Amino acid sequence: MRVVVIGAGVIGLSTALCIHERYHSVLQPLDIKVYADRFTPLTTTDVAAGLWQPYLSDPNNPQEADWSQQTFDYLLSHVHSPNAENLGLFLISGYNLFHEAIPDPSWKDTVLGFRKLTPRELDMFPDYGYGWFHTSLILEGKNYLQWLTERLTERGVKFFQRKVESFEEVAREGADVIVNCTGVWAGALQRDPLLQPGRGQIMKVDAPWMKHFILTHDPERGIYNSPYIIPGTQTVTLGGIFQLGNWSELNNIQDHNTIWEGCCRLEPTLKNARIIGERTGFRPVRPQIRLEREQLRTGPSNTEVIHNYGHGGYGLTIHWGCALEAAKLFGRILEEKKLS
């Protein structure tokens, strides 16, 4: 039973591992392999700060709220294991800031100590007039990928660096199941008109005195297009760029001044920060995630494909739920294939 996962960002690597650990003892030849064009230094996953927080509004597929709540609990049960550092996992508090009051978000009892800004906290932000403060989790993508990687390897899940043209090339070559974890690029292997790039751009800066996340929200510039400051483990992420449809994987001088001006307004101490790096990535945007089966009518008998992509600005937030569900699906195949 040879299983091929396509793609090595968080969605693939997490799905590969969650699938291994749940079914390695109940399948004898269970061969897992990861094919991916770009690996762990070079993915959208690596560009993400890793803060956990779903959209303000409720999911088109209400299941998603579970997947988020799930990923959170799991990471939270692990915040104090003594790996977390390796992981890139840690607790962080910070501010959400709005121009006008807004309902409480749905996840408010998932996060630790949710609550509203007191006018004192607000005064430090001339431009914003209401907001939240709550304690959450960051899982830095770069480390997490490095981590998932070492877990997978000792499990002898094998990695190949290679761009795949179709599902049939892979089905032709051996595989009974394909886990489709291709993110923004998913369309190139099965036209999906619903899935667009949300180009995003970020500045990594050296400002270690910054201990809180600060996120600004504005319906006029719209989701993720508004200044945010996110302390990482070695570095602070400075962002707020979102552009539907943009395919330029290039750092753009305009966008740089925008990040830079928006965050200075927000935190003037950032004047003396040293820029370290700058990076661009594509949000796999979609009205909702595609996480579902398809029997692909390849050759004599068709092969099974699990889809898992279109995770948008919240992949790190939801990956774990998503992987449990990818695996459940996978277990559903097994029984139907009379092999459990």
Ligand X SMILES: O=c1[nH]cc(CCc2ccccc2)cc1O
Query: What residues form the annotated binding site?
Result: 8-11, 37-38, 43-45, 49-51, 53, 163-164, 182, 224, 228, 283, 312-313, 315-317
- The H or E element spanning position 266 is helix 253-266
Task: Figure out which of the listed residues 63, 69, 93, 252 binds a second copy, where binding follows CB under 8 A.
Answer: 93
Angle CA 321–97–244, to nearest 5: 60
* Nearest residue to ligand X, by Cβ distance, number only: 313
Task: Figure out which of the listed residues 94, 200, 231, 321 binds ligand FAD, where binding follows CB under 6 A.
Answer: 200
Task: Figure out which of the listed residues 5, 16, 36, 177 binds ligand FAD, where binding follows CB under 6 A.
Answer: 36
Bridge partners for 204 per DSSP:
237, 277
Q: Does 94 bind ligand X (CB under 6 A)?
A: no
What residue type is 100 in one-letter code? Answer: E
Nearer to ligand FAD, 117 or 202 (CB): 202
Q: Catalogue the E-assigned strands of the chain.
A: 2-6, 31-36, 89-98, 112-116, 130-139, 158-161, 177-180, 196-206, 212-216, 228-231, 236-239, 243-244, 274-285, 290-296, 303-309
- The H or E element spanning position 76 is helix 63-76
Task: Figure out which of the listed residues 4, 16, 32, 51 binds ligand FAD, where binding follows CB under 6 A.
Answer: 51
Q: Does 210 bind a second copy (CB under 8 A)?
A: yes
Contact 241, 255 (CB under 8 A): yes
Q: Does 227 bind ligand FAD (CB under 6 A)?
A: no
Rounded Cα distance, 251 and 290, in Å: 29
Q: Does 267 bind a second copy (CB under 8 A)?
A: yes
* Shortest reach from residue 207's CB to a second copy, in Å: 8
* Pairing status of strand 290-296 against strand 303-309: antiparallel
Rounded Cα distance, 163 and 142, in Å: 21
Task: Figure out which of the listed residues 209, 220, 245, 338 binds a second copy, where binding follows CB under 8 A.
Answer: 209
The three-state DSSP-derived secondary structure of 142-160 is HHHHHHHHHHHHHCCCEEE
Chain residues in the site for a second copy (CB under 8 A): 76, 79-82, 84-85, 88, 90-93, 112-113, 115, 118, 120-121, 124, 133, 135, 207-212, 231, 233-234, 267-269, 271-272
Query: Which residues of this chain interact with ligand FAD, rule CB under 6 A?
Result: 6-12, 35-38, 43-45, 47-51, 163-164, 181-183, 185, 188-189, 200, 202, 239, 281, 283-284, 309, 311-317
